[PDB]
Amino acid sequence: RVQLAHHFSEPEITLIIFGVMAGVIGTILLISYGIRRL
Amino acid sequence: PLQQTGQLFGGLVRDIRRRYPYYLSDITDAFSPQVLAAVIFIYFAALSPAITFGGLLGEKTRNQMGVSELLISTAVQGILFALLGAQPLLVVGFSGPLLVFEEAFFSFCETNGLEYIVGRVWIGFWLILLVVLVVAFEGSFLVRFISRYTQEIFSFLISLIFIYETFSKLIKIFQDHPLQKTYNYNVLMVPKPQGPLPNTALLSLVLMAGTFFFAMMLRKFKNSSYFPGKLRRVIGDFGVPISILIMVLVDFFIQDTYTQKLSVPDGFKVSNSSARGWVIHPLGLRSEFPIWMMFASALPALLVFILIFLESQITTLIVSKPERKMVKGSGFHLDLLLVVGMGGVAALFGMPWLSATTVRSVTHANALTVMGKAQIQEVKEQRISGLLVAVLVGLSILMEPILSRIPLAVLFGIFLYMGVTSLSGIQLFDRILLLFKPPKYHPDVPYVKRVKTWRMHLFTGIQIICLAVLWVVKSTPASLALPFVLILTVPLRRVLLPLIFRNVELQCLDADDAKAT
Amino acid sequence: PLQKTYNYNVLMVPKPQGPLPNTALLSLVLMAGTFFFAMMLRKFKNSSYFPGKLRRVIGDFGVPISILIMVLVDFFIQDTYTQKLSVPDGFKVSNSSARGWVIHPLGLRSEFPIWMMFASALPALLVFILIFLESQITTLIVSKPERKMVKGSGFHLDLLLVVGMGGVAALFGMPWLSATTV
């Protein structure tokens, strides 16, 4: 039918969301690596 | 399998190293007629609930998610789980608790004026974040605290729910076409009969009873001493397909009486072409999706993760007990990761989240179980069976002329057979039977010859109270609290039960491998 | 027969003159349920469930319990018609225009000829052969030593009683009877 226009397309927005999620996961992993050592 | 290594993704790597060496055997071990019979069984056993649940959702959600989405999602996730899973015998498919959720969403999205299909694109997005952290931090090691108590309570409750739904469908069929003195002989049939019809309910009851009777008789004929052993076991393996074929022919040769048949969509298209496409924009279809609900989706994501985790892990515990002769290994971390990740990915395309259903997976394991000279000998553990089941589920749309002549009452008898056969291995059901038996007829088992009879009966009765409590919660609008009350049985076993039972009694009654302490 | 359409205006007395819906299927359901309950109660007699005395008492009454259960099931279905037992109104002959309770050996309406009084021996021989074989083979079956019969059976007294009572009842226009096997 007719969908609302967006600045980002579906692949672009899903890549951005997955990149943010991967960054959060990596930050959490690095923090957990920092703990249990010092 | 549930030990904690302390390494990030430690459980995930160990699961791959445990099962993937047996990948060559997981294809060559399927070359047997029992595997084909199990495929024919599980094809219907997974297709019929898939058709029913999608059609229900198509009603509770202006056909946003329907049979087409629940069939395509089931096919894709089943294929990917059979090809890459650590316990391929699990059948991943929609469920009741997941419908109760995907119903609250529409009662929440409709109230707040939000997009239902776009809110999920966000729940599935939040689902991927949770599972990766749980798998990396070895969150599946908490499953080792789910003992035989919780496993058997959950299995007995789920089997009772399955049998009750199977009987309630027949009750609904009887109510829709009651036994009346007169009927309107000119009633519109499309899409469904608009009035009561003669002989419909009685024929449905006859078909269900005959299907169940034939399935049970062929199952008993498998263990019987008639015919040559090879032919006898071959016929016994195909007992369910033979019963289905016999009852399908019986209904087919009765032309005049109407019985409800399997209905599948016309083609591979979305349920509501006026609502959504195949790929749903995470920012919204018609209106811009609010930013606050993007962060507010964590709580529904937490609920979905809890439901899927409990269902899949308890099902894996049930199907991979050491007493079932599973000598290939099961991976808790890999299966959970695959299921939740596939659900999160399929949330993007508008396809439902699926979980390892208990009854279907237990039936799949039992249909591949080989009985030696009464005693379990081996299980046909292979990936071809689940892969073929998923492929046939995906191809169910294209084989409409075959499915359009299969009554639902035949499937009702098959469901009753599955329900009665899923209670064999549960010691809770065994101890329920001992409540109606004299103590001198009790079997030579550790929980009888080392524990007093009344103590065992009290222990069984405590479990029965938990079953009643879980049944009451299911029959309430707050039925999504069922996983929490189910989890609360673990503190009951680990804390309150030792206050009234000795260590030897709890070891005999709650044994991880049915051992005499 | 199972039909797409039925005539809702069907005469019921003395018996339904047309096909009726839900009749044959309900009869099949009742028969299957009765057989299932009887067999399950027979298994339950030898089963290990319940106290032995109560379990054996229930198993002994298995057939009456199944009959009662299925009769109640059919009774709680008012609309559907099922064929029931039919006994006569009273202790009267079936045809009062043909014969009475005592039949004259010389004839009722026409004079009975003398030749048939001697010619009846051959049909009497056939009846005696039938009744003798039926009763004696039934007595042999029911009195086998493997059935734990410790009171004895009579092959002469029982045959004499059966055939003599059949001959006596023949005088009243009543059927001759034999010791049926089943």
Curated annotation (Swiss-Prot), chain A:
Transmembrane residue ranges? 13-35
Question: Result of mutating residue 23 to L?
Answer: Abolishes dimerization
Q: Which domain of life is it from?
A: Eukaryota
Cellular compartments annotated = Cell membrane
Q: What is the effect of changing residue 8 to C?
A: Diminishes dimerization
UniProt-reported outcome of changing residue 12 to C? Diminishes dimerization
Post-translational changes noted in the entry = The major O-linked glycan are NeuAc-alpha-(2-3)-Gal-beta-(1-3)-[NeuAc-alpha-(2-6)]-GalNAcOH (about 78 %) and NeuAc-alpha-(2-3)-Gal-beta-(1-3)-GalNAcOH (17 %). Minor O-glycans (5 %) include NeuAc-alpha-(2-3)-Gal-beta-(1-3)-[NeuAc-alpha-(2-6)]-GalNAcOH NeuAc-alpha-(2-8)-NeuAc-alpha-(2-3)-Gal-beta-(1-3)-GalNAcOH. About 1% of all O-linked glycans carry blood group A, B and H determinants.
Miscellaneous information on this protein: Involved in several unequal homologous recombinations or gene conversion events, predominantly with GYPB and more rarely with GYPE. The resulting fusion proteins are observed in different phenotypes and encode low incidence bloodgroup antigens.
Which family does the UniProt entry place this protein in? Belongs to the glycophorin A family.
Per its database record, what is this protein's job?
Component of the ankyrin-1 complex, a multiprotein complex involved in the stability and shape of the erythrocyte membrane. Glycophorin A is the major intrinsic membrane protein of the erythrocyte. The N-terminal glycosylated segment, which lies outside the erythrocyte membrane, has MN blood group receptors. Appears to be important for the function of SLC4A1 and is required for high activity of SLC4A1. May be involved in translocation of SLC4A1 to the plasma membrane.
What does the record note on quaternary structure? Homodimer. Component of the ankyrin-1 complex in the erythrocyte, composed of ANK1, RHCE, RHAG, SLC4A1, EPB42, GYPA, GYPB and AQP1. Interacts with SLC4A1; a GYPA monomer is bound at each end of the SLC4A1 dimer forming a heterotetramer.
Q: What is this protein called?
A: Glycophorin-A
Q: Which species expresses this protein natively?
A: Homo sapiens
Residues included from the entire protein: 80 to 117 of 150
Swiss-Prot record, chain B:
- Provide the effect of residue 74 to N: In DRTA4; decreased expression; decreased stability; no effect on dimerization
Phenotype for residue 331 to D? In DRTA4; also found in a patient with distal renal tubular acidosis and normal red cell morphology; impairs expression at the cell membrane
**Could you say what the effect of mutating residue 239 to R is?**
In DRTA1; detected subapically and at the apical membrane as well as at the basolateral membrane in contrast to the normal basolateral appearance of wild-type protein
Q: Which reaction does it catalyse?
A: hydrogencarbonate(in) + chloride(out) = hydrogencarbonate(out) + chloride(in)
Cellular compartment(s):
Cell membrane; Basolateral cell membrane
GO molecular function ontology, one term from the record: monoatomic anion transmembrane transporter activity
Impact of changing residue 181 to N on the protein?
A: In TR(A) antigen
The record's intramembrane ranges read: 462-492
Tissue-specific expression: Detected in erythrocytes (at protein level).
The site (Important for anion-proton cotransport) lies at 311
Result after altering residue 457 to P: In SPH4; Birmingham
Q: Which UniProt keywords apply?
A: Acetylation, Anion exchange, Blood group antigen, Cell membrane, Disease variant, Elliptocytosis, Glycoprotein, Hereditary hemolytic anemia, Ion transport, Lipoprotein, Membrane, Palmitate, Phosphoprotein, Transmembrane, Transmembrane helix, Transport
Q: What is the effect of changing residue 59 to D?
A: In NFLD+ antigen
Site note Important for anion transport applies to 220
Outcome of altering residue 120 to H?
In SPH4; Pinhal
**Outcome recorded upon mutating residue 148 to C:** In SPH4; Dresden
Which ranges of this chain reside in the Cytoplasmic compartment per its record? 87-89, 137-148, 222-232, 315-330, 368-383, 424-461
Annotated segments matching region Involved in anion transport? 189-260
UniProt effect for mutating residue 276 to Q: In SW(a+) antigen
Effect of substituting residue 286 to H: In MO(a) antigen
Q: Where is this region: (Microbial infection) 5ABC region?
A: 350-384
Report the GO terms under cellular component.
ankyrin-1 complex; basolateral plasma membrane; blood microparticle; cortical cytoskeleton; cytoplasmic side of plasma membrane; extracellular exosome; membrane; plasma membrane
Q: What family does this chain come from, according to its entry?
A: Belongs to the anion exchanger (TC 2.A.31) family.
User: What is this protein's function?
Assistant: Functions both as a transporter that mediates electroneutral anion exchange across the cell membrane and as a structural protein. Component of the ankyrin-1 complex of the erythrocyte membrane; required for normal flexibility and stability of the erythrocyte membrane and for normal erythrocyte shape via the interactions of its cytoplasmic domain with cytoskeletal proteins, glycolytic enzymes, and hemoglobin. Functions as a transporter that mediates the 1:1 exchange of inorganic anions across the erythrocyte membrane.
Disease link: Ovalocytosis, Southeast Asian: An autosomal dominant hematologic disorder characterized by ovalocytic erythrocytes that are rigid and exhibit reduced expression of many erythrocyte antigens. Clinical manifestations include mild hemolysis, intermittent jaundice and gallstones. However, the disorder is most often asymptomatic.
Please give the name of this protein: Band 3 anion transport protein
Q: Which organism is it from?
A: Homo sapiens
Name the gene that codes for it: SLC4A1
**Which residues of the complete protein does this chain represent?**
371 to 894 of 911
